[PDB]
Design a protein around this motif. Structure first.
Motif, mmCIF file in Angstrom:
data_model
loop_
_atom_site.group_PDB
_atom_site.id
_atom_site.type_symbol
_atom_site.label_atom_id
_atom_site.label_comp_id
_atom_site.label_asym_id
_atom_site.label_seq_id
_atom_site.Cartn_x
_atom_site.Cartn_y
_atom_site.Cartn_z
ATOM 1 N N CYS B 53 -8.108 -8.195 -10.876
ATOM 2 C CA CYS B 53 -7.357 -7.139 -10.809
ATOM 3 C C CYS B 53 -7.324 -6.444 -9.452
ATOM 4 O O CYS B 53 -6.450 -6.196 -8.921
ATOM 5 C CB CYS B 53 -7.252 -6.411 -12.160
ATOM 6 N N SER B 57 -4.871 -6.322 -6.514
ATOM 7 C CA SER B 57 -4.427 -5.003 -6.104
ATOM 8 C C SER B 57 -4.940 -4.389 -4.827
ATOM 9 O O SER B 57 -4.092 -3.836 -3.973
ATOM 10 C CB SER B 57 -5.014 -4.237 -6.899
ATOM 11 N N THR B 867 -3.881 -0.644 -9.955
ATOM 12 C CA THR B 867 -3.924 -1.545 -11.146
ATOM 13 C C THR B 867 -3.630 -0.446 -12.362
ATOM 14 O O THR B 867 -2.809 -0.973 -13.298
ATOM 15 C CB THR B 867 -5.416 -1.814 -11.378
#
Ligand SMILES: N[C@@H](CC(=O)O)C(=O)O
Ligand SMILES: N[C@@H](CC(=O)O)C(=O)O
Lengths: 911, 916
Positions: B53, B57, B867
């Motif tokens: 993530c 991101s 995120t």
């Protein structure tokens, strides 16, 4: 101890003791060591005397108690001629020391990491943009592609024209000593105890060596050689260091090639032995001599580094160079046996060496003999012949896979060759228009066709154009010639005979007309000069500047001239000269306007214009201020080609220390590039109007004091060492002696006079103008830079010195005139402060303020010494009780010379 | 390894890697340690998920490739409830970590040595003037004598009013953990032996974990009492000690300008106040009992803090030489269960005999409050306790004098002087509480009274009739309220509030703020209710005028109050008025509120002068002055002339308290700039605007308000859009006019879109520039030259740096119905055009190029915030649409949705900090 001297110096310059601010410490250290030297050489009493002059002088500068100036006076008039020379010598040397210290401080002062982006940042060495940062502003703020930036730099031209020191070309030997003092000082703040002890003793020794190089006037030839010293010291190496940084900056904006080695980005030129304006000592022979000397020195510099390149170029690996090596296959330091052919680059460079030697020797024989039997094929007569074999080595290394090696020393050498050519500096010739008129009038009378001098401007033009296409020569053997006419004709003889790569421009001083320019073109054609020097008029008076446009228009309208000029013209402006006629304010504004107007006229005619900046402008200050000064220029006045005067009195600051040398070259290049793509704002119409109104008033005040006051001249000759500096009235006096005489008094009348009335009148006419002026100061680069230079000049001013000179040297009936000029100074200073938004002089540049301030006590001592010396010279019946000799067939003129040189070295540039 | 994460972070924030710039390194180190922790606690796979993530991101923020946002989407919607909580927890915690690191960076960032002197210098922590430099500018640039400067500071008052964190008051335990993480980090860059580094590394690791595992989210939201206690934590952590550190620096600065005395220990220079348990506006959970409770808590905590340092002062005060005045007092006390001095003090230790008594009294004061709180009463009498601050000062002044008289001045000026200052600043109640309630509640209360008395309906009455009746009853000879007055629960709640004011000591309170004030009568109404309760020391009454129309009616309202004999006599030369930037901006758009607030303050200042009344403008939330840091300093100096005049009263917003006071240096510098700016402004006002500027500002206000109102109030489907594009409704856990300002700003901040901050500026600029091309240059000059305009533009520029129209676009795709999407699209075009106009006016290509350290700070947060945004967006789809389905991955963690959303919302708020 040393702690004590440090404390003493800090009383004049207190506050922010940060970590890279070591200037006061440096000064303390030097002064400490020099006081010991004085004790050793001249005795404790003399040391104490020097210390007491310093102290008295420091106290006077601290609190401005005029009793203190009078005490220093008493002390100084009491000294016999011998003691007096030692004291003058001591304080001059202290100045040179404080200047070396200050250079070291500017060299290592910390750059500001984050810049606000206001143009004011470019006034200051710590905040100005370097070349990379300039590239990035152009790409990111002005939307230029990196390729466009690169392309402009490739086509860009910066030419720095070195002029004589107006008082004292520092000799080569001493300048090197100054360098070693500075280096030893640097190294002391790097350190094992024994190293410090050794450096300490080496510093001590160099300070002494400098002090005792202290030995009538110098030949222009010698003045030229002294003025060339900075090449050896810094510029020679500095050019390639800076071009290499260009490479790095290009790489950091995405350009994946090096700046081409033969882009003529940097050129140096010289007036030394070229300028004969008002100076009949600069003869044809002198001109021939300095051309040969320049040629001699350049070959010699190449020759004396070629052995190093040969050592390094050991490589054994292309057929083009292989072939050349085979064809080619004693009294020197290194390769004195025949080179073997398995060392191919050395065979090539061995030949270049021999050729360089022969080129250097021809010039030497030409110089000391009158001729040489050495032939053209043995020697380089053109720069391409020297490049060619170097390009071959470059290509051979590239073709054999050694690109990376090629771009080391070989690339450096290629750049030096491309920048310096066969003559380090190209020489400008300069002579005044009236001398050409005289020469032509002799020709016309002898030809029986009348008197050129009597003829109108239209007739002059008509006759010159007819003879510029004439089928007969003008000059027969029987032409009668005064010495002046001969001296001028034989100058062209010398231009006809020496190679064209010796020369740059033929500047016409006091130009006023189309015909002035055509006159010189006719004399060059008459001498059949294969490559005539470009003809560049210097319009000096306001009226001349006002007539320049119509003059250029007419030149550019003439088929013969347009054809000759081939799309290019240079015109010269002289700030100090125009300021002598009209006052500095009105000369500044007029010069701004004239340049606009001539740019427009050039465009209209499809002529590229170069403005050559003579002395006295903001652009000649050096350092950070030069950077904004350049970016303040009117739009399109640079356009890819800068040509500026590096004034003799600034050369040391600009090029004596290697970092300062680098940064001088960098800002000249950065500023030139930027200006062409990012002009300063143009002035609002209200600003023009106000500037016109203020010019009328500034000129009226200046002219009414300088030309209409019947006793001004007389006051000038007494209050100032002008007359003694010799070793009509003001109109006839040259600009350098004008600025200099008032700079020697700490009064600087030529720089600020007229600004007072301009401001007072503007603010009195309408209260709102104060705010307009302040906005102009915050927002208009031209105005800001104009005011800053004058502000810097006031920081070097001290009306108390002028007052003292009045008491000692001016008759009683003139003293109130003096007093009234001092009130004008005060009022002018205060008006300038109010416009700049400052309580104190230079609060916008405190590092400069500190530097100037540390110098004052020394300068003041010399001023006081000078004032009484002039009293004694002027009046053989002035006497006082001399003290018994303090020190352990030399006269008052000698003391005065030391005094004048010392003051000038501390005052550096002003107007 | 660590080098790898460092490289990854530098792609977002590149360039000038200097030596004091360690922020990227700090963040890399923290993230590295936290990834290990996540592996240990939840397994490698979960670590890899978090890492992915983060990476996805980061890449998205670097190059803004929307493929990357879509990938992160896929990953995040696939997570089961349990994995989803761990991820949301992880990324929130990262944010808290990056904020701690950023604080450390601000703490140690190097000051510029040479300042240009332009007012722009005061926008930035590294260039702003400290107290000494402010002194020196006033002396040398404004020609004040040092004595004059000193005298103004002695008479000056700076009052900071602390408000609740709008989303999540950080608990005392966690805040201390955050402090230790920061300290361990600090110490790692100090000196450093390898074992010390290994030990600090392990300590850092352990604190990051401790903080991460303080993660109960509980069913019951927190009691206002508990919210109040959490909001008081910063006193213990920094402010308690920070006040004397700062006053000592004032001493040093005074000395350096030639003043040879210390700043008097009892000059009330710094005062703190609070709304926590005092503001019941639109909030019926803040009952009279709550108010009573936080007053007693404030009293309890303060006595406790004094009590728990008095023993240290007693140890240090071993001296035996005392003056006869203290000698005598000591002898008396020697005739008539603690950590340290548990035997009787001997009389050859005189200072201890005195301070021993002070200790006992403090203990009793603390205990009374505790019993009052948990019992309902205490038998403990007034003479056993401190009931007024002078009683606590008195014996401390005696010790001070005795040391001075015995030759020990220098000793006196140590701890004893610190304590004297703490006592003088914090008094018996750390914070004085403001009460706030809306005008209409008072109307309701008076209407009940008038109907019950049979004299008609106060509510139906005109303003003139209201005033007439109020002035007669304010001089009335009998009370209004009989025992049989019938009372709705709301009317009772409002009456019983005054009961609580009547009974508690007057040093518990500050102001009674009237929300939604519009009238003279609104103010008189509160004054009548206070007189009816016979409050010995009535709270000053302070109107908050909120709408533009209210701001426009404020002048006539103050004129009338100031014209009334009864009120002038009551006010005794002093009046406070409150302004609320966020509130006014909800009504009229932020541009037109900013300008109107500037004008209204001018006009009320003038009126105050005319009537010989000293005016305090109390700054509510949402202004430039509420940004904290450097920007607050120029914000204050931008105030209209004479709107401060020696007395500042500003809100420290809950979402900024951590930045302003969590770290000791930042605390110090917050106190300093509030004091420096206040002093300076009274002697060095900003330039007043040129008439062209006013004219343009007026013209621009009309247009901004038209655009803002036409979008927000006249578009019939705006509310409906707002409820789908934004998590407003879920944050609950008429239309916009009726919605409060905090949820308005918040809901758009959660979307990275910030409509409430910039909407209207676009039309203002476009119209100005199109009416006359020369206005662009006027606007730019205003920006360079007019503090108010500069500071107004800067705050909006900072907000745009926090913006990301891609997140807004994603929320539209997932949550807005097709027929509303083009409306969203057209607001995004307005955002672009508005941003670009602002840039052109500021002379910038990139957002925040004038403040690259701020830009870097905000930029390092984005990957984490993004995120959470993506996680929130799909969570809201799942909560809202149970016909949205996804293939969930098998559970990744080792050892529902509303909970994920709560974490999401709090994490986004923590990273967004202040905006509008
Ligand atoms: N060259 C310096 C002056 C000096 O150092 O004398 C300047 O123009 O600023
Ligand atoms: N408090 C900062 C914003 C932030 O750090 O989020 C400012 O207003 O400049």
């Amino acid at each position: 101890k040393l702690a004590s001297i440090d404390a003493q110096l800090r009383l004049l310059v207190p506050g922010k003791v940060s970590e890279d601010d070591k200037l006061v410490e440096y000064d303390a250290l030097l002064l400490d060591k020099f006081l010991d030297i004085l004790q050793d050489l001249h005795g404790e009493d003399l040391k104490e005397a020097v210390q007491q002059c310093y102290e008295l002088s420091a106290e006077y500068e601290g609190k401005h108690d005029p009793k203190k100036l009078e005490e220093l006076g008493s002390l100084l008039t009491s000294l016999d001629t011998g003691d007096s020379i030692v004291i003058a010598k001591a304080f001059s040397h202290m100045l040179n020391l404080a200047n070396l210290a200050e250079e070291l401080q500017i060299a290592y002062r910390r750059r500001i990491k984050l810049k606000s982006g206001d143009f004011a940042d470019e006034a200051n060495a710590t905040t100005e943009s370097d070349i990379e940062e300039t590239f990035k502003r152009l790409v990111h703020k002005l939307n230029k592609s990196p390729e466009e930036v690169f392309d402009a730099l490739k086509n860009q031209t910066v030419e720095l024209v070195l002029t004589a020191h107006p008082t004292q070309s520092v000799r080569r030997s001493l300048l090197q000593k100054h360098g070693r003092i500075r280096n030893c000082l640097a190294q002391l703040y790097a350190i094992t105890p024994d190293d410090k002890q050794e450096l300490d003793e080496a510093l001590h020794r160099e300070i002494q060596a400098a002090f005792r190089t202290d030995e009538t006037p110098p030949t222009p030839q010698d003045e030229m050689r002294a003025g060339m010293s900075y090449f050896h010291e810094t510029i020679w190496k500095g050019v390639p260091k800076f071009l290499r940084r260009v490479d790095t900056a290009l790489k950091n904006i995405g350009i994946n090639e090096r700046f081409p080695y033969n882009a003529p980005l940097i050129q140096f030129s010289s007036w030394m032995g070229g300028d004969r304006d008002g100076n009949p000592r600069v003869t044809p022979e002198v001109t021939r001599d300095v051309c040969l000397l320049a040629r001699m020195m350049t070959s010699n510099m190449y020759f004396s580094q070629i052995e190093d390149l040969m050592i390094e170029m050991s490589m054994w690996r292309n057929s083009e160079l292989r072939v050349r090596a085979e064809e080619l296959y004693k009294h020197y330091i290194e390769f004195w046996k025949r080179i073997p052919p398995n060392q191919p680059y050395r065979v090539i460079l061995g030949d270049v060496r021999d050729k360089l030697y022969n080129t250097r020797e021809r010039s030497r024989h030409l110089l000391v003999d009158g001729k040489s039997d050495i032939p053209d094929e043995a020697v380089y007569t053109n720069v391409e012949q020297l490049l060619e074999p170097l390009e071959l080595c470059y290509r051979s290394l590239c073709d054999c896979g050694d690109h990376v090696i090629a771009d080391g020393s070989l690339l450096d050498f290629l750049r030096q060759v491309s920048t310096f050519g066969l003559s380090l500096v190209k020489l400008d010739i300069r002579q005044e228009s009236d001398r050409h008129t005289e020469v032509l009038d002799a020709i016309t009378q002898h030809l029986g066709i009348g008197s050129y001098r009597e003829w109108s401007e239209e007739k002059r033009q008509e006759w010159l154009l007819a003879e510029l296409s004439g089928k007969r020569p003008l000059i027969g053997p029987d032409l009668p010639k005064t010495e002046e006419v001969k001296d001028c004709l034989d100058t062209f003889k010398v231009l006809a005979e020496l190679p064209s790569d010796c020369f740059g421009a033929y500047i016409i001083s006091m130009a006023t007309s189309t015909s002035d320019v055509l006159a010189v073109e006719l004399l060059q054609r008459e001498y059949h000069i294969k490559h005539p020097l470009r003809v560049v008029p210097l319009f000096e008076k306001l009226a001349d500047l006002e007539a320049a446009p119509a003059a250029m228009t007419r030149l550019f309208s003439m088929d013969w001239y347009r054809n000759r000029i081939d799309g290019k013209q240079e015109v010269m402006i002289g700030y100090s000269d125009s300021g002598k006629d009209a006052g500095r304010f009105s000369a500044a504004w007029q010069l701004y306007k004239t340049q606009e107007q001539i740019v427009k006229i050039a465009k209209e005619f499809g002529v590229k214009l170069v403005i050559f900046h003579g002395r006295g402008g903001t652009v000649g200050r050096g350092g950070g201020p030069t950077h904004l000064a350049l970016l303040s220029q009117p739009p399109d006045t640079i356009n890819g080609s800068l040509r500026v005067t590096v004034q003799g009195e600034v050369i040391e600051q600009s090029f004596g220390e290697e970092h300062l040398c680098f940064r001088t070259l960098q800002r000249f290049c950065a500023a030139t590039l930027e200006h062409g793509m990012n002009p300063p704002i143009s002035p609002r119409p209200e600003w023009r109007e106000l500037m016109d109104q203020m010019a009328v008033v500034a000129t009226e005040e200046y002219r009414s004091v300088v030309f209409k006051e019947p006793r001004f001249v007389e006051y000038f000759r007494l209050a100032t060492p002008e007359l003694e500096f010799g070793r009509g009235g003001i109109e006839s006096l040259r600009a350098i002696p004008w600025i200099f005489s008032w700079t020697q008094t700490r009064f600087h009348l030529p720089v600020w006079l007229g600004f007072g009335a301009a401001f007072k009148h503007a603010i009195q006419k309408d209260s709102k103008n104060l705010q307009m002026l302040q906005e102009m100061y915050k927002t208009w680069p031209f105005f800001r830079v104009t005011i800053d230079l004058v502000e810097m000049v006031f920081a070097k001013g001290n009306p108390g010195i002028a007052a003292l000179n009045d008491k000692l040297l001016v008759s009683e009936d003139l003293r109130p005139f003096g007093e009234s000029l001092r009130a004008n100074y005060e009022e002018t200073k205060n008006y300038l402060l109010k416009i700049a938004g400052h309580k104190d002089l230079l609060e916008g540049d405190p590092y400069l303020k500190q530097g100037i301030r540390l110098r004052d006590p020394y300068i003041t001592t010399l001023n006081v010494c000078q004032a009484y010396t002039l009293k004694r010279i002027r009046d053989p019946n002035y006497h006082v009780t001399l003290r018994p000799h303090i020190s352990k067939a030399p006269g008052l003129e000698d003391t005065l010379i030391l005094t004048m040189k010392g003051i000038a070295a501390g005052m550096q540039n002003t107007g």
